[PDB]
Amino acid sequence: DRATKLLTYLADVTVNGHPEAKDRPKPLENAARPVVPYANGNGVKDGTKQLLDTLGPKKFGEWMRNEKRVLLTDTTMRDGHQSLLATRMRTYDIARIAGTYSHALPNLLSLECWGGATFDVSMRFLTEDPWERLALIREGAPNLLLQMLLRGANGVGYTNYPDNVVKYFVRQAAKGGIDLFRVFDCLNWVENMRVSMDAIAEENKLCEAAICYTGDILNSARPKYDLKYYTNLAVELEKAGAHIIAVKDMAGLLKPAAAKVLFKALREATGLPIHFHTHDTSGIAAATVLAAVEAGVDAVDAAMDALSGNTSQPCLGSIVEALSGSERDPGLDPAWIRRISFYWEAVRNQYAAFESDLKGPASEVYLHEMPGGQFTNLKEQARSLGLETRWHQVAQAYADANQMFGDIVKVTPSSKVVGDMALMMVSQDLTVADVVSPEVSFPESVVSMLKGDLGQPPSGWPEALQKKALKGEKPYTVRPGSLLKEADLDAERKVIEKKLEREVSDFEFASYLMYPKVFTDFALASDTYGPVSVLPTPAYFYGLADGEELFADIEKGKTLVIVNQAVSATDSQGMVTVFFELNGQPRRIKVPDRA
Amino acid sequence: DRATKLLTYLADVTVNGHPEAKDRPKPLENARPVVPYANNGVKDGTKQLLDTLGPKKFGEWMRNEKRVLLTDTTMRDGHQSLLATRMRTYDIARIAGTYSHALPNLLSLECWGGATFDVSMRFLTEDPWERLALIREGAPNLLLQMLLRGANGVGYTNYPDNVVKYFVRQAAKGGIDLFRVFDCLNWVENMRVSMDAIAEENLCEAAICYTGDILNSARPKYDLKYYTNLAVELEKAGAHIIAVKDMAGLLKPAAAKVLFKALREATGLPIHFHTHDTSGIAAATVLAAVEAGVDAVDAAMDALSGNTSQPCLGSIVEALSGSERDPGLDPAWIRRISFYWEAVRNQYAAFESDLKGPASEVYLHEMPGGQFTNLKEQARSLGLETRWHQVAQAYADANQMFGDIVKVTPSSKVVGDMALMMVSQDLTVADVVSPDREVSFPESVVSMLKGDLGQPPSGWPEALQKKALKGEKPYTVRPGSLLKEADLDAERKVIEKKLEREVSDFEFASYLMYPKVFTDFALASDTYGPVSVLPTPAYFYGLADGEELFADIEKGKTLVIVNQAVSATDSQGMVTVFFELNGQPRRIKVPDRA
Amino acid sequence: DRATKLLTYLADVTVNGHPEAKDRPKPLENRPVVPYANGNGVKDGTKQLLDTLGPKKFGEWMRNEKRVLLTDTTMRDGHQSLLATRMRTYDIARIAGTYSHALPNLLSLECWGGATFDVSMRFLTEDPWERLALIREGAPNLLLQMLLRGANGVGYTNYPDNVVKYFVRQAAKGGIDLFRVFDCLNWVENMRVSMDAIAEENKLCEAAICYTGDILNSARPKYDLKYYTNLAVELEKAGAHIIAVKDMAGLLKPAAAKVLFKALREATGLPIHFHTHDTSGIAAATVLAAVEAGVDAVDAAMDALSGNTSQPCLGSIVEALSGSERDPGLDPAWIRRISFYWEAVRNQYAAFESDLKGPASEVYLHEMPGGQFTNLKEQARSLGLETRWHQVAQAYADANQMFGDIVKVTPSSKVVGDMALMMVSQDLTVADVVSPDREVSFPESVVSMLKGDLGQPPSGWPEALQKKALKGEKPYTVRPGSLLKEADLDAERKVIEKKLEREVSDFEFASYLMYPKVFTDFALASDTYGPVSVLPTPAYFYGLADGEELFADIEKGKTLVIVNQAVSATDSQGMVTVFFELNGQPRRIKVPDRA
Ligand SMILES: [Cl-]
Ligand SMILES: [Zn+2]
Ligand SMILES: [Zn+2]
Ligand SMILES: [Zn+2]
């Protein structure tokens, strides 16, 4: 019955295709399967996971601070594909390489592999459990820290949630396998980060408080975000119990000359170690990383070569090659970086359907300040609205919109707000002057932000815009969550357990709390189709070719051999019959003809 | 009759397609590049300066200039790396004025030499001279820069000295101000003839090609002293500018800080830095070079930057903005020009490679940015697509076997051929040089080892050379020194009789470099007319049924052409295209090549 | 402008196809050639004789003639049965001279009336008068024969007497020498007006008695020998110059011929003319019997359009008679040559071929006219009754009997058709149809017949059926035309002439009177498209192939050379442009894209 379920899924995608791939491009028919590198044989040298375990978070931080080598964080398992491949990368390909990281690059600080779009996308678009993924990575790399990006007021959700819910998620994330939480707030508002950070500490894990970088500190024309801005925030975040301070350059804006300044300054402002995350949209982020290294930053992020560049992180292989031999040499085998990268390359070719059209670096990023992770996404949305040939006007509108909102920090989900605004502005051919003129029906998201739902920026919201937009509704300036009733967690669990006619795990409950509808759908899908996550990627998105033989591991130990022998015409009752051979035995599966 | 000829070409590509595009991808059916509306006359720039100061003194001016000077490679190295050099005069010339008006403070435009000379005739049916002339006319305030191949010129082989000398005279007359001359084995003796010619024509940018790693004591062959000595040698040989041509994109930031401090101490000449962004960090190196005092650096427009190209011009500039060494270039204008190039690029969908981003692997194979895609496609051809990384490894091993050489055109082709065979025939280095395995080496490898591409500092590996040369005695003198001076008058009579007409000096120059390509091109020109005047889509794809086109045959005069209908193929194997030219019916018959 | 018009027609058919051919079969992708004739002038024939003798004395001449006289139906009844009357003037006119030169001994050419008049305008965009005129010009030594419908003329309804009269005057002026007038219910009182008109035009009045039932079957006494002989004596008294036996359904069996013809010759001094159809596959036997028994003149179609629902084979009936006392005296090699032409002509009309595969004795059961048979079969398929065709046939027999055993020919046969079809569709028996229960809504045509519109049969209409069908309306039994007001011919001409904004010819007016709407439409078509009739048949139905060269004669002498050089894609204004070369000169014609 687990196999029967799988056979049904396979029968379905074989006959109807996967909705996410049905009309996008296919992978080159050649299709050289990704091969996990054969590893030497030895056991695993202890790494940071062991260290944090022995030292606790406060003392681990002090260890990073004092470490001479630069520490590296690989974002391939998360930010890399979230930017390049619409986060569509599957547990099957991610889990399979965790052990090779463990054995080959034990000196890595952490693996960014959870949070961001992954939580929601995995259930919604890949029919797989984000928890199962974390568990598998954990099991494969028990010597490295596992890192997530955590969204502060939302957690990993899409809305605001009562505090106990955020608190509950964090406890589960920790239990689940996460060691290092990079928590950020879209308006860099410390008051809105407190609940989160407290929760991370209470779980005795690493609280990496992030300051989001925007504007230009070396540009006196734009004083709103100067050096003092960040250093103060660092002091504030330290006082709020951070173990690590992080500079989250979501749009890839930090320029090398600024890095030299910003990182000298931050190390002087706080005893806490500093962690630098950036994006390579400019095509110069590596310069910035290296500057930050030279200027004494403690840890930086990079992606594997085969998923680096552009809206991703800059190239991990080359940053390492640059640092090799130097006093701050990170101590990582390039042959191994290369071999893992080749794996990633082969893995990537499977995801052809989710490649964007971006051709290379763009200094335009310094104008629009679109997050690397929003860029493609907003471009596709622009095509949707029939604006493909005005994309640069969209970009300009975004810049203008930003300034109109008072020059805000643009990241999830504030950057979505500016997006929506820009798109409307071009569609409806409205200027800023037009927008704030004394009739516009503003986007739901803009109304919401201005009401106060995404928090408050340092100088508040522009009075005039806000009045016009809110159209009567009185705006608030307290912490958004402070106004939401504490959730009755027991009743809300009863709700899901009745709907699914069974008990759920704490993790499943956590998922439900963040994404009630997506989770519900996924649970139902699961009951129907079985543990589809065990299928290799091609089979998952494309089913099986006529004649094709597939090996699929249903339950560790047990391997099913499945052959697509034949596919019937569509019968009077609208059904197609796929003729399989499961482990040498005939099986006939009926699925509906969805066409 | 010029119109009749164009109508024939259009009719032919409409019915048969262009061979270069017929089976590659098409551009998104949506779609045109629009030249930015510019505000004034043109502020004087470097072209004026060189005119007043001469080359020696111009160099001194660069040396003393505080701002960093920028060279745009978009018109040459950018598309040679990204689009198989298939970029057309039509799109290149149209923007030259916008450069002239909008970015006058630019040092130069790299827009000639390299693959462009040969590819433009061979694959684009256009005169490389007409192109240079048009750029010249559009940007009379900027220096025009070419990459010149030293012993070959722009050719594919070695040539007698007078022939090299002749080309350079014409190149200068043609409009080129700045010659970046290089030699594939960094052999100064092999550069001398070229440099002397450039000087005789009154800017000689002598290039040292960067390879290995100076800050790696494990690889001493190419240490700091290597380069500084070459600089002192090249200065003594009459260079006006010293250039670091990092063809493979190997120079790492920590090395830039060292190398550029050292070079400026080694020579009074100004330094010019060219690199490729294969690593995905070349921008870091550029900026390092700028901080360490380099005089001038190369970058491509954003829309044609990255990867095997130059690093992003737009962002390097944004990074330097506000700093003491600020290059002084309007970013809004950089962005706007880039937007044009982006729209220009989408036309060339057929020539896009599959390369997805940065690769630190570059530090292993050391393949020039400009050879990389090309060698990958060749690898697929030989059915090795799925062993590309073994090809890369073989290339690294081959390099070492040849004694660790400088790999650039055409030495890099030699290592390429070698690696490919090695993988095909499943041979190790041990195998290649075994006294037991009969190996038939590539023509190119036999040639290099005989001495045809010159001599590396430590000569050729005795054992390999003996086995490869298979009897033939090798030489170590300068290759050109052995070629008989060409009787330029007789050789001109040859082409002029064959083409049944006089040729211009530039045409003769073309013929000398590429006898067969030129011949073909001339013949094509007589048949098809000035195809270069056609916009890019029309050129590669003809006209759609019903489609209206505007084409400017002779500046002033504009033709309006409509494809009204296309016949079935007749008994005599011909298709008839029904045009409307300026409101008059015209019927053009072309053969059905299918 | 005549040429421009033709070019437009050619452009239109080329791009849109002909509606009548667009979806039927095409002819084999692999031209008819008019036989080269010796070179002599034309021997005088019957046309000269009638001219010299007048109609009364011409008949006496036929009576006394020893050879059997032949009438070729290929130009009319042949293709009306086999090809839905779709045969074009172009093909018909071209051979008329070959008849004239090669078979001068022929009595007549049936080439007008029946379906031809109406179909030629409606489906072939051509003037039936232009045709008659062209035939006349080609064969000035043979009699031209029409089948004239008595009460209708050539129309589809009843008309006032003056109108009938007017048509006949024109018909005669047009070129017709021999009128075979018939009445669907064999009602002489309904023929009188017509016959009187023919005589007043000093032309041959062939009065037809329609054959039905079986004279040698005592089980069916309604139509016995006395029936026909009396009719003959009646029609002789009514001024006929010739009696004709019109066996529309091909019912007359040989044994009966021997009897009926002996008898008729004894009943009247007038000469007898025998028309039949070969649906039984034995009509030739009956013809030959009629000859042996002394009939004066018989009908046959050319070999290539003979058999089945057509006339029996002219070639073979002649070969049979060759050498005998009554030998018709016609060159068989010439019959064969003309027949080969018809064969090549026929392949052009592939679109109009039926699916009939050969003889059917079933004809003795349903008594469907040869000319109605395919037509009713196609209509049956329309109504979704393809697989019940034999039930249809049976219903027709039953319906006939229900109506009291009527003579089934145009348009009474149409009435029986309509009844049968409903009977099968609605699954009603005769008992059902006449039940004082089942509420039946009878066909308009059945209501009409029973009211009295198609005249009165010898024994009147069945009381019970008539009451039920007429649903209140009082029925009449006077002559239908007698109740129609004499038409004010002058006003009615003003009507057409204003509508067409021009004078019309008498012939045109005649056409209008018979078929107001069809003619109107044709006149408008003519203004648009020019003399399309001059175009060869393939070109007419199918336009011109890419590259194809065509010769068309616009005005005798002048020949146009037309080449289809190219065809454009459809432009924004929905138009397609065809590129012609007319006599060496470029021409561009725009037609709408009807698809
Ligand atoms: Cl009508
Ligand atoms: Zn990021
Ligand atoms: Zn280059
Ligand atoms: Zn008949």
Instruction: Using the mean position of ligand 2's atoms as its centre, give its distance from the Cα of residue A284 in Å.
Output: 15
Instruction: Using the mean position of ligand 3's atoms as its centre, give its distance from the Cα of residue B249 in Å.
Output: 9
Q: Which of A423, A446, A471 is the last residue of a domain?
A: A471
- Sequence-distant (6+) residues with CB within 8 A of B338 are A362, A363, A364, B301, B302, B303, B313, B314
In a domain? residue C54: no
CA distances to A42, A76, A222 from A99, in Å: 12, 15, 47
C175 & C216 share domain: yes
CB distance C561 to C548 below 8 Å: no
C566 touches chain B (CB under 8 A): yes
DSSP B271-307: EEEE---TTS-HHHHHHHHHHTT-SEEEEB-GGG-ST
List active site positions of A. Answer: 79, 248, 412
CB distance B464 to B401 below 8 Å: yes
Q: Do B312 and A287 touch (CB under 8 A)?
A: no
Domain span at residue B538?
1-30+530-594
Contacts B306 to A, Cβ<8 Å: 283, 309-310, 359-361
C586 touches chain B (CB under 8 A): yes
CB distance A558 to A564 below 8 Å: no
Please tell me the distance from the alpha carbon of residue B303 to that of residue A391, in angstroms, as a whole number. 14
Please tell me the distance from the alpha carbon of residue A552 to that of residue C555, in angstroms, as a whole number. 82
Q: Do C566 and B566 touch (CB under 8 A)?
A: yes
- Sequence-distant (6+) residues with CB within 8 A of A340 are A37, A97, A100, A101, A104, A105, A304
Sheet harboring C549-555: ordered strands across?
A: C549-555, C558-567, C575-582, C585-592
What is the sign of the dihedral through the CA atoms of A430, A434, A440 and A446? positive
Nearest-ligand number for the alpha carbon of C513: 1
A207 & A308 share domain: yes
DSSP C49-100: HHHHHHHHHHHHHHHH-SSPEEEE-IIIIIHHHHSTT---HHHHHHHHHHHH
Please tell me the distance from the alpha carbon of residue C381 to that of residue A334, in angstroms, as a whole number. 80
In A187-305, beta strands by DSSP E: 206-212, 244-248, 274-277, 299-302
Instruction: Using the mean position of ligand 3's atoms as its centre, give its distance from the Cα of residue A314 in Å.
Output: 22
In a domain? residue A55: no
C151 & C257 share domain: yes
Look up tokens 């992978």; give the residue.
Answer: A27
C-alpha distance from B496 to closest chain A C-alpha (Å)? 46
Q: Do B360 and A338 touch (CB under 8 A)?
A: yes
B378 & B343 share domain: no
| Chain A residue with Cα closest to B313 | A363
Tokens describing residue B131? 């192109």
In a domain? residue B187: yes
Known binding-site residues of B equal: 1-3, 62-63, 65, 76-77, 80, 149, 245, 274, 276, 295, 409
C497 & C546 share domain: no
CA distances to A321, A348, B150, B228, B230 from B196, in Å: 40, 52, 11, 21, 17
CB distance A343 to A537 below 8 Å: no
Query: The domain that contains C115 carries what CATH number?
Result: 3.20.20.70
Length of chain A as a residue count: 595
B-C interface (Cβ pairs under 8 Å ≥ 3): yes
Please tell me the distance from the alpha carbon of residue C213 to that of residue C405, in angstroms, as a whole number. 9
Contacts A291 to B, Cβ<8 Å: 284
In C200-334, beta strands by DSSP E: 204-210, 242-246, 272-275, 297-300
| DSSP H/E element including C173 | helix C161-174
Please tell me the distance from the alpha carbon of residue B108 to that of residue C559, in angstroms, as a whole number. 71
> What separation, in Å, do the N-terminal and C-terminal C-alpha atoms of chain A show?
27
Instruction: Using the mean position of ligand 4's atoms as its centre, give its distance from the Cα of residue C122 in Å.
Output: 21
Contacts B338 to A, Cβ<8 Å: 362-364
Query: Rounded to the nearest 10 degrees, how much is the dihedral formed by the CA atoms of A107, A109, A115, A119?
Result: 10
Show the CA angle centred on residue B67, arms to residues B63 and B68, nearest 5°: 75
Q: Do B305 and A255 touch (CB under 8 A)?
A: no
Cβ atoms within 10 Å, residue C290: 28
Look up tokens 């006929």; give the residue.
Answer: C240
Cis status, amide bond into C411, omega within 30 of 0: yes
C568 vs B564, B568, B587: nearest CB = B564
Q: Please tell me chain A's helix, strand, coil percentages from 3-state DSSP, rounded to the nearest 5.
A: 50, 15, 40
Q: Do B356 and A326 touch (CB under 8 A)?
A: no
Chain B interface, best mutation among C570, C588, C591, by max B CB count within 10 A: C588
DSSP B75: I
Nominal resolution in Å?
Answer: 3.0
Catalytic residue among C8, C12, C74, C77: C77
Please tell me the distance from the alpha carbon of residue C305 to that of residue C83, in angstroms, as a whole number. 9
What burial letters (b/e) apply to B455-467, b meaning 16+ CB within 10 Å? bbeeebbeebbeb
C-alpha distance from B361 to closest chain A C-alpha (Å)? 7
Q: Do B564 and C579 touch (CB under 8 A)?
A: yes
CA distances to A312, B85, B88, C460, C527 from B373, in Å: 22, 12, 20, 98, 67
DSSP C478: S
Tokens describing residue A277? 């995350």
Tokens describing residue C388? 């019940």
Greatest CA separation for chain B: 76
CA distances to B20, B196, B331, B541, C593 from C569, in Å: 27, 62, 46, 17, 9
DSSP C525-582: HHHHH--GGGS-HHHHHH---TT-EEEEEEETTEEEEEEEEEEPPPPTTSEEEEEEEE
Tokens describing residue B191? 């550069």
C-alpha distance from A100 to closest chain B C-alpha (Å)? 19
In a domain? residue A291: yes
Query: Rounded to the nearest 10 degrees, how much is the dihedral formed by the CA atoms of B257, B259, B261, B263?
Result: -160
C565 touches chain B (CB under 8 A): yes
What is the sign of the dihedral through the CA atoms of C244, C250, C252 and C254? positive
Residue B40, SS3? Answer: coil
Residue A484 Ramachandran class (φ > 0 left, ψ -120 to 50 alpha, else beta): beta
Please tell me the distance from the alpha carbon of residue A421 to that of residue A426, in angstroms, as a whole number. 9
Residue A16, SS3? Answer: helix
Give a three-class secondary structure readout of B223-262: CHHHHHHHHHHHHHCCCCEEEEECCCCCCCHHHHHHHHHH
Q: Do B305 and A283 touch (CB under 8 A)?
A: yes
Instruction: Using the mean position of ligand 1's atoms as its centre, give its distance from the Cα of residue C519 in Å.
Output: 6
Cis status, amide bond into A413, omega within 30 of 0: yes
C13 φ, ψ to 5°? -60, -35
Look up tokens 């650039």; give the residue.
Answer: B408
CA distances to C216, C395, C397 from C219, in Å: 9, 20, 16
A375 & A385 share domain: yes
Contacts C546 to B, Cβ<8 Å: 567-568
In a domain? residue C60: no
What burial letters (b/e) apply to B552-578, b meaning 16+ CB within 10 Å? ebeeeeebebbbbbbbeeeeeeebbbb
CB distance A42 to A103 below 8 Å: yes
Cβ atoms within 10 Å, residue B505: 14
Cis status, amide bond into B410, omega within 30 of 0: yes
C588 touches chain B (CB under 8 A): yes
DSSP B187-209: -HHHHHHHHHHHHHT--EEEEEE
A287 & A349 share domain: yes
In a domain? residue C522: yes
C432 & C388 share domain: yes
Give me the total of CB pairs closer than 8 Å, taking one residue from chain A and one from chain B: 172
Contacts B585 to C, Cβ<8 Å: 586, 588
Catalytic residue check, C77:
yes
Look up tokens 């080598």; give the residue.
Answer: A69
CB distance B293 to B331 below 8 Å: no
DSSP C312-333: -BHHHHHHHHTTSTT-----HH
B585 touches chain C (CB under 8 A): yes
Query: The domain that contains B452 carries what CATH number?
Result: 1.10.472.90
Tokens describing residue C78? 């042949």
Chain C interface, best mutation among B567, B570, B579, B586, by max C CB count within 10 A: B567
Q: Which of C352, C368, C399 is the last residue of a domain?
A: C352
A337 touches chain B (CB under 8 A): yes
Please tell me the distance from the alpha carbon of residue A140 to that of residue A96, in angstroms, as a whole number. 8
**Experimental method, per PDB record:** X-ray
Catalytic residue check, C246:
yes
User: What angle separates helix B253-266 from helix B282-291, to the nearest 10 degrees?
Assistant: 40
Q: Which candidate, A80, A27, A85, places its Cα nearest to that of A356?
A: A85
- Sequence-distant (6+) residues with CB within 8 A of B411 are B184, B185, B405, B448, B453
Beta bridge partners of B587: B578
C517 & C557 share domain: no
- Sequence-distant (6+) residues with CB within 8 A of C36 are none
> What separation, in Å, do the N-terminal and C-terminal C-alpha atoms of chain B show?
27
In a domain? residue A45: no
A407 & A542 share domain: no
DSSP B2-22: HHHHHHHHHHHHHHH--TTTT
Query: The domain that contains B524 carries what CATH number?
Result: 1.10.10.60
Tokens describing residue C133? 């005129």
Beta bridge partners of C303: none
Please tell me the distance from the alpha carbon of residue A441 to that of residue A444, in angstroms, as a whole number. 9
Chains linked to C by 3 or more Cβ pairs within 8 Å: B
DSSP A315: B
Query: The domain that contains B559 carries what CATH number?
Result: 3.10.600.10
What burial letters (b/e) apply to A50-75, b meaning 16+ CB within 10 Å? bbbeeeebeebbeebeeeebbbbbbb
| DSSP H/E element including B180 | strand B178-181
Q: Which of A530, A547, A562 is the last residue of a domain?
A: A530
> What separation, in Å, do the N-terminal and C-terminal C-alpha atoms of chain C show?
27
B315 vs A32, A218, A361: nearest CB = A361
C297 φ, ψ to 5°? -155, 140
Q: Hey, which residues 498-527 in chain A have their CB within 8 Å of chain B?
A: none
C579 touches chain B (CB under 8 A): yes
B576 touches chain C (CB under 8 A): yes
- Sequence-distant (6+) residues with CB within 8 A of A383 are none
Total domains present in chain A: 4
Known binding-site residues of B for Zn(2+) equal: 77, 245, 274, 276
A346 & A491 share domain: no
Tokens describing residue C578? 């065809």
B147 φ, ψ to 5°? -95, 120
Nearest-ligand number for the alpha carbon of C521: 1
Show the CA angle centred on residue A582, arms to residues A580 and A585, nearest 5°: 95
In a domain? residue C477: no
CB distance C346 to C32 below 8 Å: no
Chain A interface, best mutation among B32, B215, B250, B279, by max A CB count within 10 A: B279
Contacts A348 to B, Cβ<8 Å: 356
Contacts B570 to C, Cβ<8 Å: 547
Q: Do B570 and C579 touch (CB under 8 A)?
A: no
Cβ atoms within 10 Å, residue A546: 9
Beta bridge partners of C405: none
Q: Hey, which residues 129-168 in chain B have their CB within 8 Å of chain A?
A: none
B361 vs A338, A348, A388: nearest CB = A338
**Residues bordering ligand 3, an ion, CB closer than 5 Å:** B 77
A464 & A538 share domain: no
CB distance A546 to A528 below 8 Å: no
